[PDB]
Design a protein around this ligand. Structure first.
Ligand SMILES: [K+]
Length: 290
DNA sequence: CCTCTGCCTCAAGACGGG
DNA sequence: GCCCGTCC
DNA sequence: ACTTTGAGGCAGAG
């Protein structure tokens, strides 16, 4: 994500962070990064050193995680759309089996040209969902107006939901969106390096004073704060500001009734889940729809 | 103050019975 | 409520 | 990634 950004916001713009009750999200739609979440399931849902799996050794940890997490959100009246990345390893088989499961649950999903986080942001911008619920601060860096942070952790711990508001962030820092991108690069982004010596304090000052990365190097003393060689900040700046994304007007998001017999055939027949648990999950899914 | 860096420890996904 | 054992 | 791995606290040097 962005190295330090949540702590920085809590340190300098805490009013951009709202603590809200899970009950106030009832009826809201939220975009969720399927690629990221599959990966977390592959790491966490383990037994005796291995993922869960059927008799033939096919992994089911991603399905276990995605089935019950999705039911849990719907039971809270939060209607999710999952976004799959575009251009422990998450395979194509993981993706396709999670997509199959979600159709069978009646849960929508979209495929993203490139970065799921950015395309999640594009759904928020366009008003197609209320927020992105992801664990990546870079959603804010991609321009997303609202980001629900640690939704599942808060749900389990019966804790209030941290909700980051990009507009209040810019207002407290005195920064436009373009200038906020450059800050996040200085903090440390996935795309390129950060200047050694320049931490969260020094980064905010220079951005507020000078307003752009290229300006910074000119005013910076090269001897004291040398930038790394062939620094790709220009390209990273371009990846955040104008990312390849899907069209949020393009696909209608619809939430359908779950296809129980096909879910039994697939989760129980093939993947060898317990039939009682799958029916019990479906029943809660039906009740959630109301 | 400000950034490193190194040394430490401590859940982690979800459900449900006890 | 909180532990833990178990899920496949 | 639980027979491990990252964050997050904390303290000390440049
Ligand atoms: K740095």
């Amino acid at each position: 994500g962005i190295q330090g950004l949540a702590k920085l916001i809590a340190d300098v713009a805490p009013s951009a962070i709202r603590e809200n009750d899970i009950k106030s999200y009832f009826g809201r739609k939220v975009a969720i990064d399927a690629s990221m979440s599959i990966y977390q399931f592959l790491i966490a849902v383990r037994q005796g050193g291995d993922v869960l799996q059927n008799e033939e050794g096919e992994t089911t940890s991603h399905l276990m995680g995605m089935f019950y997490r999705t039911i849990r959100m719907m039971e809270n009246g939060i209607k999710p759309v999952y976004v799959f990345d575009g251009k422990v390893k998450v395979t194509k088989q993981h993706n396709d089996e999670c997509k199959h499961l979600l159709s069978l649950m009646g849960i929508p999903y979209l495929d993203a040209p490139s970065e799921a986080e950015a395309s999640c942001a594009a759904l928020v911008k366009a008003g197609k969902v209320y927020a992105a619920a992801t664990e990546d601060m870079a959603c804010l860096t991609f321009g997303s107006p609202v980001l629900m942070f640690h939704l599942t952790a808060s749900e389990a711990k019966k804790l209030p939901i941290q909700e980051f508001h990009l507009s209040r962030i810019l207002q407290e820092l005195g920064l436009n969106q373009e200038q906020f991108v450059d800050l996040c690069i200085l903090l440390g982004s996935d795309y390129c390096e950060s200047i050694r010596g320049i931490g969260p304090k020094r980064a905010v000052d220079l951005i507020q004073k000078h307003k752009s990365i290229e300006e910074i190097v000119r005013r910076l003393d090269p001897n004291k704060y040398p930038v790394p060689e062939n620094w790709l900040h220009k390209e990273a700046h371009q990846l955040f500001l104008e990312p390849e994304v899907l069209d949020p007007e393009s696909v209608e998001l619809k939430w359908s009734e779950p296809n129980e017999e096909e879910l039994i055939k697939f989760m129980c027949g093939e993947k060898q889940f317990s039939e009682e648990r799958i029916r019990s999950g479906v029943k809660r899914l039906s009740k959630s729809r109301q």
